[PDB]
Structure formats: C-alpha cells, structure tokens
From a paper:
The transcription of key genes prpC and prpD in MCC is activated by MtPrpR, a member of a family of prokaryotic transcription factors whose structures and modes of action have not been clearly defined. We show that MtPrpR has a novel overall structure and directly binds to CoA or short-chain acyl-CoA derivatives to form a homotetramer that covers the binding cavity and locks CoA tightly inside the protein. The regulation of this process involves a [4Fe4S] cluster located close to the CoA-binding cavity on a neighboring chain.
An X-ray diffraction dataset was collected and processed at 2.7 Å resolution and phased using the single-wavelength anomalous diffraction (SAD) methods with the selenomethionine-derived (Se-Met) protein crystals. Interestingly, the Se-Met protein crystallized in the P212121 space group with two axes of very similar lengths (a = 142.37 Å, b = 145.96 Å). However, the native protein crystallized in a similarly packed unit cell but in the higher symmetry space group, P41212, with a = b = 144.87 Å. Nevertheless, the overall crystal unit cell volumes and the structures of both forms were nearly identical. The four polypeptide chains organized in D2 symmetry. The shared surface area of the interface on each chain were around 2400 Å2 between Chains A and B; 1250 Å2 between Chains A and C; 340 Å2 between Chains A and D. Since the four chains in the Se-Met structure were virtually identical (Cα_RMSD < 0.3 Å), we focus on Chain A for subsequent structure depictions.
Numbering used by the authors:
A (entry chain B), B (entry chain A): 153 to 480
C (entry chain C): 153 to 465, 467 to 480
D (entry chain D): 153 to 465, 468 to 480
The structure:
C-alpha cells in the first residue's frame, strides 16, 4: 500500500528527517531568507541559484497548483494561491530539483519500499523540506514556545495556514531541541483518516480513530472554531486533543468542495504548555472523556454510543431487558 | 459476526416479514387498539390476555428501559420513557412472550444462522413486531401516502419518534400494498454505520457508505435539522436521501450521550412523492451531487475530496505538478 | 406595553409569588399528588374536585394545546403534548378556575397595571401556578441542590422540558429556602428577547442583551447542546451563563417552526455550585469573556466585534486602518 | 447620528457614486493595472505618481491595518493582510491623497450632513473608491454576469473576500450598464445589523430586519456555508436572499474574534440569474418562506415564532395556543 508504506516510513523516523531539516534550515540561512514575503524571495532564489523562472500563471488549469517544465526551467504557480501556499509550492519544487540526491539517499535507507512507494516517498520528503524551509526549525521552535503553541498566531507570524503549522509542530523532534510530542490526524465528515503523523508511538499512529465520542470528529459540527478535549483511552493513558476544520475557498457554489478536520494530540502531561488548556482543569481524572479507537476494538463495557459489539467479548442477549447500552 | 448475520437475514427477506407483520396488525385490531395512548392500552392488553402486570418503575438502574420478571409475570417500564417508547418496550415484551413460536419458526427459515445470530435475530424480530404493532400496516401506509412521507407528521400522528418512523417506512413491502422502497441507514459522527435495512438492493445495503460528500454524514453539521440531497453514484444511478440527527435526552450534563444520524434513501424516480422534494428541481441531472461508496472503491477521477486512491487503478506520481485533486 | 407591564410585575416581586406558590404546594400535598404521571393525576383531581372532564382530543385544531368549555366543564388537551405538557395545560386551567380569587387579589396588589396588562398578568400568574404545582417548591428545591442544578436531570426526574425547569429554577426565592438567584432569558436567532425573569437586579432584567459575544446568542450555532460561559460586564461584575436551544417537534417539514434559546445566568460566586462549572477554572479573572449589554450602550474601547458607536463619545483617521470599528 | 447619516447618504444615491466610480476605473486603466497581484502594482503606482513609499510593516500594533505618515510620505501596511486586503488599504489611502477634491465635492452635495458625518462620509467614499479600483466597473460587471453572480468565484478571480465582492455587487447602478439591484446586509450573532446598502428601496434599506425566520440570521447556524432562501414579506413582495458568515483569522485562541454574516438580497424576479438558484423551484409561491421586518411591526396572524405582539392589534383564559400573541 503505497501511502501506508510512506506513513510508516515517517512513523519509523519519528516524523523528523534530520539531514533534510538541517538542509532546509541551512539553505534558508545561507541564502538570506527572512520570514515575511517568503514567496517573493523564493522566486528570487530560484532565479539566482537554479536559473528557474517562476511565473504566476492565471492560465493554468483550475485545479493545478503548480506545473514545472524542466526543459525550459519554468515554474508556473496558481494565481489563486495565497503567498504562504505559493511559497510552499516553490519550496517543494526546490526540494525536488536541488535536493534530489539527499532525498534519494534518504529513500534508500528503507530498502523495503515498493517502487510506487518510493515515488510517493520522494513527494513526501519534498513536502517535508518545504515545511522545514517555510518554517526554519530554530525560529519556529522558539516561536511555538513563545506563543504557547497558538496555532493561529503561528500561522499569522509565518504567513501560513492551520494545517501547515500543525504539520510542522508534529516534526519538532530534533535532538536536544524538541517540542511537545504530537500526533497529527486529518479526517473528513465520514471519518476517513487521510493523514497520520506522530512524533512517537500513539494509539492512532497507524490504525484506529473511529470513536464518535472523540472530539476530532466533532469539528465538523463547529466549523472554523477550535475544539479541544481531555480524552482517556481504555488503557488509562490520557491525551489532550485540539482540532479545527479547514476549507478550500473558491471552487464555486456548484464546484467540488474540500472539507477536512485537522487534529493535534499530545500526552495530558504536556497540556499545561498549550494556550488551549486555558480555563481547563487538567488534574481531575473524573472530568476526562472516555473514548476508544473504534468500537470493534474497544473493550469498554457501558458505552451508550457503542456502534458495534467488541470483537473480543460475549454478545449476550436478554429477552427480558431493554437497555440504552447497545451490545452490553 | 452475529449482527451482520441478522442484517443479511432481514436484507434477504426484503425487510418485510409477512407472517409477523400480519400477526401484529391482526392483534392490533382483534384486541381493540386505537392509535393514541397505546402505552395504556398495551398495559391493559398484557393484563387481560397474558396475565402480565405492567408497572411504571422509577427504581430501575438508569440504563434500563424495561425489566420483565417471568416468575411473577411483572413488566417494569422506565418512567423516563415517553409514551411511544413505553409502548415500544411493552410490545417488544408482548412479541417475546406471545409470539414466541412464530418468531422461532421465522428464525428457523435460515438454517445458516449461528447460535448467537439466532438470539440476536429473535430480538430483531421482536423489535419488528413492536414497530408493526405500534404502526399497524394499513393505517400507517395510508398515513404515509396522505402526509406525503412527512416523518415528523407521521411521528406526531402515531406518538413516536423520527428513528421509529423511518424504521417502519423501510418495511412497506407487503405485496399489492407497497410503499416507496427505502434504504434505512444509521451512522455516528465517526461514520460508523450501525444500522442497514433495505426494501431491495441498494449500494449501501450491506457494505460501504464512507463518502464524505454523502449528505447523511453532513447531518451532524446541521444538528436537529432535516438535510436532503440528490446524489449520483459512479455507475449513474441517482437517489434521493433525507437524514436527521437524533439525540437521547436526560443522562445529564456529565453523562454519556447518544448521538446518531438516521437516513432514508430511495431511487430518484420516487422523490416527487416526498414532501422533502418541495422546492427541489429533480429533472436536472446537473444539480445532482456525485458521491461514492468510499474512496478506496470509488473510480471517480476528479474528486477534490478523495481521501484514498481507488484500488482499481494506479496514479503515477508527478514531481512536476501540484494539484487540488488528491491521487489524481 | 402590556407584556412589559407584566414583566415588571414579576420583576418587582423578585419572580416569586409566595401566596400562589404556597397555594400550589398545599394543593399538591392535600390532594395526594405524586411526582410522576402527574397528567393522569391532574385529570383525576379535576374530575373529583371541580367536576371538570379532561379529554385528550386528537380532533383539536393543529395549534390548540387546550380549550376549556365552561358551560360543560370540559377541558380538551392536545394529543401531541407530552405528559409533562399535558400536566402543565391542566394545571393552568386549574389555576384559572380554582385559584381565580387569589390571582385577582395578587393582580390587585399592582394598581398601575392597565386592563390588558391585568389580563396578561392573570395568564402569567396561572402559568406560575402550573410551574409551582408540577414542581412543588420543597421537593424541587431539594432535587436541584442534590443534582447540582443539572437541568436535564431535573427534567428527567420531574418529566418536563428544559424551558420549564429553567423557569422554575429562577423562582426559588422563598425566604429561608432560597436557591441560586438566577436571571432567565429567552431569545430567537434574530436576538429578540421574548422572556425576562430575574430573582434580583441583573443587567438584562428589563433591557439590553444584544451583545454578539454573549454565549446565549451562540446557542443556535450549537443546537440541542448546552453552551456555557464566564462573562464580565463593563462594570467588572462577573456572571456564569448556561444556555441551550429548544425546538418544537411535529409541525412538518414545511410547517411553521418554533426555535428559541433559553439561558440561565447567575453571579460567578455561585458558579461552583453548578454541574456546568465542572472542568472550568473559576478563580482566574483573565479567562473571563468581556461582553456588554448592547453596543450603543457599551463603553468598551477595544472591541473588535463592535457593531455601533458608543453613544457617550468617535474619531475618524484618514491615515489609519484599524480592525476596531468605531475605535 | 453619523453612521446613520452616511448610510442614508449612500442610500439616497442608489449606492452608486458615478463620478468617483469613473475616476477609479480611469485611474485603473491609465496606470496600466492588471487584475492579479494588484497590491504590488498599487505600490508601484503610489511611488510613481504620488511619491509615496509602500512598505510592509510587521512592527505595527496588532489592530493596525495600515498607518500613513504624511510627513515622509510612507504608507505602512500590515503583514498579516492578504494581497487583496493590502491592495484595499493602499487604494483607500490613494483615494484620500489623490481624490481628495472629488471626495470633498461629493460630500458637499449633501449640505445636511453634520460635521462628524462629513468625516465619516469621507472615509465611506474612500472605501467606495478602493472597491471601485480593485473591482473596475466594466470588468467586474462582465465577470459577474459571466459567472452568474458566484460570489466565491468572483472573489477568486479578483483576489478578494466574500464581503468585498458583495459590497461591489450592491453598487452596479451605472446607467445603461446596471447589474442585478441588490440590498447588502451585515449582521452579528445578536442580530445587530451594522451595514445597510441598497441599489433601490428595499424593506431593510434603513430600518428593520429582526425576523428570526429570515435566512440571514440562520447563517451562524450553518457557519462558513452559503445559505439561501426565497422570502415573502407581509406585503406580498418576494425576494431571494443569499448569505454567509465571515471570520477574521489570526487574533489567537484567546484573542478577540470578529464574526459577521453578510447577506445579499434581490427581487425574486432576478433570482433566475443567480447561480444560487440552481436546484431551486422559483415559480411556486407556496414554497416561499413568510418572513417579516420584526415582530413588533409585523402584522402576520399565525406565526408560531412571534416574539412580541404586533403594535396594530386579547387574552383567552380558556385556550392554550402554540401561536404566541394570536
Ligand atoms: C496525502 C496527500 C495526497 C494530501 O493531498 P492534498 O489533500 O492534496 O493536500 P496537501 O497535503 O497537498 O496540502 C494540504 C495542506 O497541507 C500542507 N502540508 C502538506 N504536507 C506538509 C508538510 N510536510 N509540512 C507542512 N505542511 C504540509 C500544505 O501546505 C497545505 O496547506 P494549504 O492547504 O494552506 O495550502 C499529500 O499530502 C501527499 O501526497 N503527501 C505525500 C506524503 C504521504 O504520502 N504521507 C502519507 C501520510 S498518511
Ligand atoms: C442494532 C441495535 C443493537 C441498536 O440498539 P440501540 O442503538 O440501543 O437502539 P434501538 O434500536 O434498541 O432503539 C432506538 C430506536 O429505534 C426504534 N426501533 C428499533 N428497532 C425498530 C424496529 N424494528 N422498527 C421500528 N422502530 C425500531 C426504537 O423504538 C427506538 O426509538 P426511540 O429512540 O425514539 O425510543 C438494536 O436495534 C438491535 O439489537 N436490533 C435487533 C438486531 C438487528 O436488527 N440487527 C441488524 C443490524 S442492521
Ligand atoms: C411569553 C409567552 C406569550 C410565551 O408564549 P409561548 O411562546 O407560546 O410559550 P409558553 O410560555 O406558552 O410555553 C413554553 C414553555 O414554557 C413553559 N413555561 C411557561 N411559563 C412557565 C412558568 N411560569 N413556569 C414554568 N414553566 C413555564 C411551558 O411549560 C412550556 O414548556 P414546554 O415547551 O415543554 O411545553 C407566555 O409565556 C405568556 O403569555 N406569559 C405570560 C407572562 C408574561 O407576559 N411574561 C412576559 C415576560 S417578558
Ligand atoms: C462599517 C465601518 C464603519 C467599519 O467596518 P469594519 O467592520 O471595521 O470593517 P471594513 O468595513 O473596513 O472592512 C471589512 C470588509 O469590508 C470590505 N469593504 C468595506 N467597505 C467596502 C466598500 N465600500 N467596497 C468594497 N468592499 C468594502 C473591506 O475590503 C473588508 O474586506 P476584508 O474583510 O476581506 O478585508 C466602515 O466600513 C465605514 O467606514 N463605513 C462607512 C459607510 C457606512 O456607514 N455605511 C452604512 C453603515 S450603517
Ligand atoms: S464503544 Fe469505545 S470506540 Fe465505540 S463509541 Fe464507545 S468509547 Fe468510542
Ligand atoms: S473519491 Fe469517491 S468516495 Fe471519496 S469523496 Fe470522492 S466521490 Fe466520495
Ligand atoms: S461593543 Fe460591547 S456590546 Fe458590542 S460586541 Fe463589543 S462588548 Fe459586546
Ligand atoms: S411575527 Fe413571525 S414572521 Fe413576523 S417578524 Fe416576527 S418571527 Fe418574523
């Protein structure tokens, strides 16, 4: 499974690629970058260092974010992208043409990847490079701690959106300068989890996450507003979750619509460092919400929300009782 | 998998159990039932015909809707249940003590069921009987046509809730007295589909339904309000879907909460008979929403919402292109 | 204005009518009532004590909750009403036919009411009696304290809805057995405040409440779910607000729809007694949301949400762009 | 009451200022502007034609969108603004320094304005100019008709937000090149209507609009999604309404938040021209929603939602109704 192979590639590397990250930051510093208008400077850097001409093309197809023409070294970027997104596109292409060898050797370090998986992993590492270039490690880590992890304020400072900030936060595993260890999740209204990235072993790092009581799936009921939750898994470990929906503009009233929820999760021990714990009492184990990973694999015994019987237990029927607890 | 076995049991019988339904209706008429306050009348019927004392009990555990004591023939019903729900509980018990043999032979018609499945199927048939007794077939079918399938108005007339009405609408397959053929779906915020029932073969009768563009998963974003949609599958068949959330009251601010979405679906050809098509243009194939059964088994080529690649194809990676269409 | 006259009538009486309340409770006790299935028992009491025959009529007009025919003493009640609501209707009629004189003298205690206002006040006092009969003071006050004011659990225990419980909670001003002093508000999506009741002087007891940052107006964004907020008025006083929407069933997809939000508010000092304070930090004056009574009468100086200029002040700056309207 | 004075100022002029609009368009064309990245080009224009240096400032206070320093001719623009918004700020300053006399004479055409109202109206005309420069009349009107008034698609093409597009749509009253006549509304969660603009006389042009059944107040229930409604007033006139909430980003989790709903309304006769009529049956007077201007002045007799009694109209101790103040 190509995308699952790459998910596991990043999971195995603690969602941190030291050489690549360093590389991005080095290039950011050596080439004189300054956060603020990074799109203009990335165009200039492409001109000066790779002979690549960046044009903002309002003639690209409606769905095309960028197209690179290697024969003339011409990078076309969609006019409808915001500066942060233009910067991301340009930095992705920069990874692919100017960091090709580093990415190739990083891919080689996992000899089990399939061919399709290797192509997908190249794209994933280029996206990682773009993130670590738009958000150079040191500056971003300092900003995240100074701002107490306010994702919106971080976006505002670095001119990027919610999802990108959450990506970068889940990558702060540089030895001796680590940020809060995070698990990053992306889902749609139907529960499809299309992105999993985690600094370390979490319950939802690879599978699971279909618990309707979990706040991430409640984001769509509160669109564009940040939701939060103190959650306890069936094994007693407790976690702090923040989430928010993200919507793709334009498209048109009739157009195809993009709707996702992005969630960030960490051990409850770290919650006190988040602006999102403001007003919440964290030391009270009785105010935690009991959630699970998905009913078929959830051993809780008195859940009123349970959707399916637990695959490990007895499905006893009682003809003489009516209960508000399904499959109890 | 017992609950899947029973799902397929009802699916194979076109979600209509002729013997049982008729039994219900007969008993409704022979014993003088009158729509309105069926809970009191069912208590009287239990007493007069089975010697069973129905008492309203506020001492039962919080989660108990009813408890039947066969040794003294005493049926205790939860005080916090509305009259329609009390009637449902009492009539479920009525099925189980007074229709035991009929239920057993109906189960016997499927010699492939496992033991657990046989018990679960008995409970399912008891629920079917309860529904067909609270909503006797002729009266309810006539009401459904008279009210143009307005689920709220049907509930008001028969003193029951949204979910029950939808249950009953999905069973009107009595030969020569058929209602609109429906597929009934129940989901949670996480997309777990816990109920599937269908008059005939529909796409989601047994599997699938994890398409984020399908309006059933959008019910939770518009809580307590009826949502509707003209949906088109990848094979061209068009359907009308109506859905609404249902919440279990009481429980308390800290208590466990029950939240589900219930959807009714039919061929687009039938939509014009629904009050829910009022104001909607049905003859315009361009105003239909293109949905799927779930990205991994969806062959659409330009879905902006796609969460996973379609397993029936391949998408080569293109290092030189950025798209708003995932897995193009 | 007739409805404002009666609003002020109840406001002046601290939203507690001692004689009437006591009356209800006595009647509840002397006639052997038991909380649970009060609708059946109220029908029995109407027959035994007033010769009033209660029929559940599925033939009433669609919008009629009840109609009383004094010539035959026949009380018709809508079949689509839940048992708690039927009980309420029956007890309203009970107030009007069996407590006529008490209500008349209570109204007489306010010589300023207009004639229309006196009629509206009779109906209001009958509703008060119905509330105090379905929810007898002693039992309900004890239950509220035991349940830490969980409105849903009170509704479950007494078989009534959110709005009725909140009504009754805001009336627990009986000397030597007081509940948390509350201000009761009902609004629609457009901000129209159609009900105001308060145990004591609150900011929104009589006027105001059009602040978009106030959580009550956010109830409609989170339908059927309880919303809560620690609010600070411009004068520094802090309050705890809980609110929830209430929707009228039936009616039909095309039918006329009723949607309201009901909010309960009290001084922050009392918040710790509410189940709704669970998980909330109450001692931190910095986590309070700064709201007002309505922009035109709100003196805050750096509100990004401000809708209109404050009437007490108004500078234009051709050389500046601000995210603060009417700085 | 300055803001009500300026509201009436624009209402009296059909929400179209012909001289200023033309000016904007001329300046757009004469200076070689091209739709797309107008913020950079407006910086260039400011420098070349008025000697004003536009700098992107991340040192301004958090609430300052721009500060112009007339003593050194330096316009500082907030870094957290999107390109359309930076362009809007720059064009506002351009109005105020380069169209000062035109704006002054336009204000002078209403000798009844108070002193404060004159300043507020100067700002209003500067904003009008910014809109008419970012969205040049001919080009924008053509785009609106081609795109069937898709507000999002118009925003995408011209690099601006929902509210700005709706603003511009409500001004297309240029003689012989008119767009759909619209009434533009902005409200908050509490029903406060802070903006009213109308091409012609509509019910809510100056007063009213507190009807809970009106779809504009339902936008917050469906945040960030376009809502639509076919509404009929108590006088029989029918209207098509579209609305959507708009939220101000940044600010922070604890920060002060800006939330508004912006609604566009037109006569039902025009609805068939809107993309938003797709899927709606428009000819069925029975599928129209009966709304009002606000209960105290609404004469409907069977509204279940009624909040206050109608001022133009008895208690019945023997009846209980689901229709308040019947
Ligand atoms: C999974 C995938 C197809 C999603 O495609 P998509 O839905 O079109 O969305 P994208 O991921 O391209 O971009 C969406 C947002 O994420 C951000 N983003 C993506 N990867 C990022 C990264 N590594 N660091 C920071 N931000 C990132 C983009 O900036 C964008 O922000 P925007 O919406 O404001 O422009 C795509 O991310 C991909 O191919 N990834 C390769 C790595 C991979 O397979 N990971 C598997 C994890 S389960
Ligand atoms: C699947 C199941 C465990 C769900 O349990 P639950 O979530 O606790 O909910 P219930 O279905 O018992 O009751 C919920 C509502 O559905 C209604 N309902 C349930 N079965 C019904 C039926 N056959 N006909 C009509 N209404 C029905 C109940 O009256 C109730 O209405 P209310 O909430 O307003 O009071 C349970 O329905 C069950 O055991 N069913 C029988 C087995 C079966 O059919 N399996 C096939 C699965 S597709
Ligand atoms: C204001 C008024 C017209 C509202 O009418 P309405 O919108 O038809 O709503 P009602 O008040 O009739 O009933 C709605 C709910 O409030 C409850 N309620 C009303 N008065 C109550 C009281 N005094 N105590 C407890 N509950 C009460 C009812 O039980 C009902 O609960 P339900 O929805 O579960 O059935 C009506 O309450 C009234 O006439 N009041 C008279 C007093 C008055 O004028 N108050 C002015 C306040 S500014
Ligand atoms: C209403 C007002 C006082 C304060 O408004 P505010 O809430 O602080 O915000 P602004 O109106 O300045 O800007 C909000 C949006 O409207 C847009 N906008 C404002 N005036 C506009 C116009 N004339 N044309 C087009 N777009 C306009 C801005 O571009 C901005 O878009 P953005 O959010 O993407 O950046 C101010 O707009 C004003 O000066 N109005 C004068 C005219 C008036 O009084 N009208 C009637 C009001 S009762
Ligand atoms: S059974 Fe477990 S996984 Fe399912 S809803 Fe309950 S807590 Fe969540
Ligand atoms: S790919 Fe298919 S299943 Fe997935 S969102 Fe698109 S239409 Fe729905
Ligand atoms: S100005 Fe006052 S009343 Fe208006 S939104 Fe701000 S705090 Fe609320
Ligand atoms: S009476 Fe009804 S229709 Fe008229 S304004 Fe009030 S809520 Fe709207």
């Amino acid at each position: 499974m190509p995308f699952e192979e790459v998910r596991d590639f990043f999971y195995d590397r603690n969602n941190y690629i030291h050489d690549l990250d360093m590389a991005a930051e080095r290039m950011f510093t050596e080439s004189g970058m300054r956060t603020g208008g990074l799109d203009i400077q990335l165009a200039e850097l492409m001109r000066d260092r790779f002979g690549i001409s960046v044009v903002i093309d309002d003639n690209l197809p409606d769905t095309a974010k960028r197209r690179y023409h290697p024969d003339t070294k011409v990078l076309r970027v969609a006019h409808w992208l915001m500066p942060g997104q233009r910067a991301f596109q340009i930095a992705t292409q920069l990874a692919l043409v100017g960091q090709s060898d580093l990415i190739s050797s990083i891919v080689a370090t996992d000899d089990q990847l399939s061919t399709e998986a290797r192509g997908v992993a190249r794209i994933g590492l280029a996206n990682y490079f773009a993130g670590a270039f738009l958000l150079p490690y040191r500056e971003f880590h300092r900003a995240a701690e100074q701002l107490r992890y306010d994702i919106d304020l971080l976006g505002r400072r670095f001119g990027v959106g919610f999802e990108t900030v959450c990506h970068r936060l889940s990558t702060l595993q540089r030895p001796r300068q680590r940020g809060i260890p995070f698990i990053f999740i992306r889902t749609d209204k139907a529960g499809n989890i299309s992105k999993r990235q985690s600094a370390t072993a979490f319950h939802f790092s690879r599978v699971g996450g279909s618990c309707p009581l979990w706040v991430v799936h409640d984001a769509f009921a509160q669109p564009e507003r940040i939701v939060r939750q103190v959650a306890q898994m069936p094994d007693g470990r407790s976690y702090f979750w923040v989430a928010k929906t993200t919507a793709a503009d334009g498209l048109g009233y009739l157009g195809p619509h993009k709707n996702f929820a992005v969630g960030l999760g960490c051990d409850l021990a770290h919650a006190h460092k988040l602006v999102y714990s403001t007003g919440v009492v964290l030391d009270d184990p009785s105010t935690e919400v009991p959630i699970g990973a998905g009913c078929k694999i959830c051993n809780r015994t008195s859940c009123a929300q349970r959707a399916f019987p637990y695959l490990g237990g007895r499905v006893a029927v009682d003809e003489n009782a009516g209960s508000s607890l399904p499959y109890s």
